[PDB]
RNA sequence: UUUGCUUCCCGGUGUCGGGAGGCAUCUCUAUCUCGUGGCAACACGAGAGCUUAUGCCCUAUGUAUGGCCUUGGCGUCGUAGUGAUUCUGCGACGCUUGCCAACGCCAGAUCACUCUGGUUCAAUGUCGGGGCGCUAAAUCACUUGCAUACGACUUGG
RNA sequence: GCCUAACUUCUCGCUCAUGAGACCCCAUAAAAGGUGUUGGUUGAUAUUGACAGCAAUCAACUAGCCCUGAAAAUGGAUGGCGCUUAAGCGAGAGACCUAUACUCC
RNA sequence: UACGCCGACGGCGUUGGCUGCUCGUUCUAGCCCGACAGUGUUGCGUCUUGCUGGCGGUAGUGGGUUCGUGGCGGCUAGCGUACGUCGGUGUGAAAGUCGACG
């Protein structure tokens, strides 16, 4: 039976991992740069400071996490937005582990918590 | 765009599709030839001409 | 010490759940539990299937909608220990508290002239649509 | 080819910058880029603005070169420029966007329901018309 | 900021380098980009400047073996493709993968003949001073060796005729829709009230 | 390819990746839209920050019973059209899909969030069953000489 | 602007070059010219109507950008792509990016 | 239960980043009044209405500029643990799960 008000859409903002904090011949993999959808200013980018972010990717070995009923090939790297970057709405993020370079251009989910609205 | 072959192709014309004509079963255009005397095949050929 | 409640969170306020299996659901906030500091909330289990449980304010968006919550009398045995964790099965005791708490809440919504939208609003899950940017949305 | 012009007394609409969204009257023209405007009755102080931030409206006041704020106020109120401007689709769209930007979640839900019901009914009517 | 689908851009009245840099950034950020009517892209400056620049480009060929030298593409689509290639790190894996996501065409292929195309106003040719000459990449390609200017012209004419017919039909349907809303007014009055109150109409 | 095998469907099972839906005129930029008169050029009337892609559609509990409203989507099939091969219109037939009484009534809960949309979607490989369905060629060695360092090329059984 | 982290950000001008120009050392350019255009200096005439033809004009200078002076051998270099109310030249304004430097842990 | 190995949310300490109100301080007006001079001037000529300039007034009203051994906020980061509230895992095997390397 239909579960009485099922999920209807996203609860995250779409973003992409555009690269690491860098000069021109240096690179600091400790900090990542994200581009969010619909954000175009540092004023708007400041709204998301302190929000959690996640990167989901697919691995080979499956895992049956507690709270899951089916083995899944998806793993996650968690992080958090720390501050805006530049004038055009990019943000800086810090991840539990440095984001793999293979995530360039891949989806990053900007969650809405911890909330402060 | 398309190619329409004659209903009857000469043996020597069909040889050109082969490297071992003598050793083969010479099946080239055998199914295509039947299309000229078929209701659906005739329609397809007419559509190609159009 | 107990956590400081956000100014927007007052009894009867309708919140949006941001995490868990109930993420996106619109629920009703009853009171801040004294011991843990979490929020005792229950979007009427009848409407959206959200039972009577706790949730931290960090995982909630407080909207400007408020339902008349002055009629509900929370039983004294409903406290942090009551929700303290022990294959979960809903104890027959639990169901009765939900009926006790929700009954005045449901009646208040029904009396409200907007009961048609209020029931539908609480029975629907929030989601981010096309060209909907949280930094410009007024919740 | 050009109807509206930058002339003394022309009522301009501030499109970007400090007093965005308000109306003023051109009291002087300094050069090809700068105009002295003064919107006394629309909460705009007598200032000099670059024409890049301004947009011409259809209203022209009967002003004089460098009319003082008192005279500009008199002309503005006499012509009822604010009321006439509020009747244009230019102002109606601004009002609609102002309402839209401040919709609550409940209001958004109500709008969703009403909009889809109206669309369904209009589609039924359109099918009726199309069949005929 | 990724787009779910490919970004289909109508190249007409666009400045070559500006549009190329925008598209290169999008490709690097991971989107797929399709450019239509690449023969309608514009280059500022008189035609002689662009023609002589392309002639000097043609002069760059390996003395030992021209089959290794620079490959001078004449089609407008390939000209735009090479312009974008110039603004990518195409010698690296990142740049190569970015470039492989670009498709530039002359005219509108049947696959995209029924889709809406985008424009970049920051790359439009109307940001130039009106008293400044500009060249059309279609003419440049034709003068440097492109052989399909006439074919593309005929195909575009047919496409425009069909589009005009479709647009006439669409105008008729739009008028019918307006009439349908007017007819439904009494039934929808209850919902129109809320819609207008919340400011959507 | 007389066992082998194309194709469609049902199942297993390997490998792999992505990560919230849809949207068709053109031409023009020192003018444009609508209405009317015009063969046309053009003309008259009314408007026109233009922020209608800064938009518009879509947007969710299950019977029953009653009142409506009969539309929209999906699939197959059959015609007709479309040539820059797929995509459209028309049907015909199926599977569904809206609102009101009304959250009226039944179910829904995993204890506060940590990869589920709380079985996310795609791409293919392979192994089994079925449904229509088909029953080939290259190559070696000889031979030819228009060819040839050797391969290759041109011929025939 | 993209390579390339950071604005096709804001203000005023100048410049069209049949490959313009584009940032210390630095990776060449001169004497001499232009009725191209933009500013200035000086001396004149002009409403007792200035020059041309049967309402401003004339002359000489000056200096910004542009143009001529400006020819070399493998195909080639403002670093490349490209850029023309610039992504060039000059005066400026906000913000922003980035060291093994500075502050703190 | 406690304890290990990890995560989340709060508190506190430290170094911050962004962003508002509010008082005052310095140097100064405008608005307003008076005469005088001028003129990109409306309506019908030592006209009038405008507009400008300094000069003299400031009662009232009243903005710019400057910063304070000033006052009150909002959002948020790294590091550590005046410390709390909690979750995953691990107490025979084994499997799975968790953790660390890689």
PDB file of C-alpha atoms (C1' of nucleotides) in Angstrom, chain D residues 8 28-29 46 64-68 70, chain H residues 30-32 40-42 49-52:
ATOM      1  CA  UNK D   8      13.855  67.999 -18.092  1.00  0.00           C
ATOM      2  CA  UNK D  28      18.905  68.664 -14.948  1.00  0.00           C
ATOM      3  CA  UNK D  29      21.231  67.088 -17.505  1.00  0.00           C
ATOM      4  CA  UNK D  46      18.137  65.102  -5.087  1.00  0.00           C
ATOM      5  CA  UNK D  64      11.853  74.037 -15.216  1.00  0.00           C
ATOM      6  CA  UNK D  65      15.607  73.799 -15.598  1.00  0.00           C
ATOM      7  CA  UNK D  66      16.888  72.916 -12.149  1.00  0.00           C
ATOM      8  CA  UNK D  67      13.486  73.054 -10.478  1.00  0.00           C
ATOM      9  CA  UNK D  68      13.926  72.991  -6.724  1.00  0.00           C
ATOM     10  CA  UNK D  70       9.548  72.019  -3.626  1.00  0.00           C
TER      11      UNK D  70
ATOM     12  C1'   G H  30      21.328  72.329   2.938  1.00  0.00           C
ATOM     13  C1'   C H  31      15.903  73.342   3.994  1.00  0.00           C
ATOM     14  C1'   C H  32      14.075  77.997   5.848  1.00  0.00           C
ATOM     15  C1'   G H  40      19.982  77.776 -20.063  1.00  0.00           C
ATOM     16  C1'   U H  41      13.511  81.084 -17.768  1.00  0.00           C
ATOM     17  C1'   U H  42       7.122  80.101 -17.508  1.00  0.00           C
ATOM     18  C1'   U H  49       7.034  83.194 -12.413  1.00  0.00           C
ATOM     19  C1'   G H  50      11.409  80.463 -12.093  1.00  0.00           C
ATOM     20  C1'   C H  51      16.658  79.425 -11.485  1.00  0.00           C
ATOM     21  C1'   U H  52      21.761  80.675  -9.990  1.00  0.00           C
TER      22        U H  52
END
